[PDB]
Amino acid sequence: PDAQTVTSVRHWTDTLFSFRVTRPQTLRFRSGEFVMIGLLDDNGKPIMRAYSIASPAWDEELEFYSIKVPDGPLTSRLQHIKVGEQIILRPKPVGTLVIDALLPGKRLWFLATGTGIAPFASLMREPEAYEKFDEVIMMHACRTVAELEYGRQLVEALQEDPLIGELVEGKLKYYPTTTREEFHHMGRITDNLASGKVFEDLGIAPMNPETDRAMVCGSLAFNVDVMKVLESYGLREGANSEPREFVVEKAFVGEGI
Ligand SMILES: Cc1cc2nc3c(=O)[nH]c(=O)nc-3n(C[C@H](O)[C@H](O)[C@H](O)COP(=O)(O)OP(=O)(O)OC[C@H]3O[C@@H](n4cnc5c(N)ncnc54)[C@H](O)[C@@H]3O)c2cc1C
Ligand SMILES: Nc1ncnc2c1ncn2[C@@H]1O[C@H](COP(=O)(O)O)[C@@H](O)[C@H]1OP(=O)(O)O
Ligand SMILES: CCCCCCCS[C@@H]1O[C@H](CO)[C@@H](O)[C@H](O)[C@H]1O
């Protein structure tokens, strides 16, 4: 188990923060995968938790998007982490949110809620996504506007980039929504896909197995409800052994805070 150093921290809300750490020279992974990271308790025993790598495979540094669960063994501590301090990292990537587990196609959808946007923060900055697919749709649903900030700034920086800010724009469509606070676009991913509102707002054709591929990341309940909506459009679940139209992964275990 490696010990890497925090090089920067940013707090978004009273329950969300992101940070970057040095990457082990040897660590290799595919954008979208996750690894175990953690801290030591008081007796010096490791407290490890799965975490999607929020940064792309080519990024020399590792990024993470994290929840804050006071009373949560890991994040009650991790939320206090400072630049210069370190985290325990098991350099062994895994996960079902890899491009290789999807049949090639034209449109790739990223469906996420809460911190579930983490593996897509990585995949949206992954070159392969824009060369194996013509369009990338990022649907991010959270309760408030503030919880969408991390994703917004990330997406904004890609579209404003002097060199590719225009190459991405037009190919990457950002569709954030809130379900509690007022915002120009609201509603759950499931409802907006079922009613067809999102196809409407983005001016695109309905979803179909022939052109559409999807990756889902949220609570287990979300994942289940989303799978039903996807299957009702013709798409099917795939895997690395038998690639299909969509793949899913739990954003966290339990009902979530
Ligand atoms: C494949 C996989 C990947 C994950 N990737 C991330 C990630 O990139 N970032 C991240 O913050 N977490 C991620 N999680 C959750 C993560 O593993 C830990 O649960 C998180 O670090 C909280 O740990 P804790 O010890 O502070 O609280 P825990 O005791 O683990 O959880 C207490 C409760 O808080 C809630 N909770 C935990 N994590 C979240 C979350 N992210 N969002 C909303 N509610 C949550 C759940 O109800 C949980 O039961 C991932 C989980 C899995 C299974
Ligand atoms: N089973 C589900 N299907 C679709 N959307 C969900 C589901 N469960 C929660 N959501 C939504 O995902 C987001 C994050 O929720 P949470 O913070 O509780 O984990 C919220 O917008 C929430 O919408 P809503 O507020 O309507 O439940
Ligand atoms: C020789 C032991 C190296 C431990 C590396 C993994 C990080 S461990 C981590 O470290 C922080 C300060 O760095 C502490 O504040 C925190 O409580 C502790 O869990």
Side-chain angles (χ1 to χ4, degrees), residues 34 49-52 65-67 69 72-75 115 251-253 256:
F34 74 91
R49 293 290 184 276
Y51 263 82
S52 298
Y65 187 47
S66 179
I67 189 64
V69 185
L74 178 61
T75 62
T115 56
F252 51 78
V253 177

Side-chain angles (χ1 to χ4, degrees), residues 122-147:
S122 169
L123 284 154
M124 283 192 282
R125 293 179 285 184
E126 167 56 62
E128 183 172 356
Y130 300 101
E131 49 198 47
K132 179 177 176 173
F133 294 98
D134 301 319
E135 296 190 7
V136 180
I137 310 297
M138 178 73 252
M139 290 182 80
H140 191 195
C142 294
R143 292 199 205 79
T144 77
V145 174
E147 316 186 78

Side-chain angles (χ1 to χ4, degrees), residues 3-8 20-22 61 82-87:
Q4 299 305 314
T5 309
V6 176
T7 64
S8 76
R20 297 178 63 92
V21 311
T22 57
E61 269 198 342
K82 307 305 192 67
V83 168
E85 294 184 308
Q86 301 186 304
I87 65 165

